[PDB]
Amino acid sequence: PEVGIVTLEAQTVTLNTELPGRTNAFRIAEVRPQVNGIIL
């Protein structure tokens, strides 16, 4: 009986995570009329 073992050794690794996402407006508003009429 034989296997393929790997010698585990202490390594120096940095811990960083990537969070995917979409950009979005900080704030949004709509422009609307509140009286009837013609746009001058």
Partner: protein, 52 residues
């Protein structure tokens, strides 16, 4: 007898109509301030300022 029953009727008639209108006006004004029905965490506002 200074005035017919008809006149006083028409009068009290309009008076009631008014009282009615006011109450309805009051209610609509009150609804302009949207409140939270309960207490909890509120999320994103599905409506934009200026929206209709």
């Amino acid at each position: 007898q200074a005035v017919s029953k008809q006149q006083y009727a028409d009068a009290n008639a309009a008076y009631l109509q008014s009282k009615a209108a006011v109450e309805q006006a009051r209610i609509n004004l009150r609804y302009t301030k949207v409140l939270s029905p309960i207490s909890g965490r509120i999320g994103r506002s599905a409506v934009t300022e200026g929206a209709l």
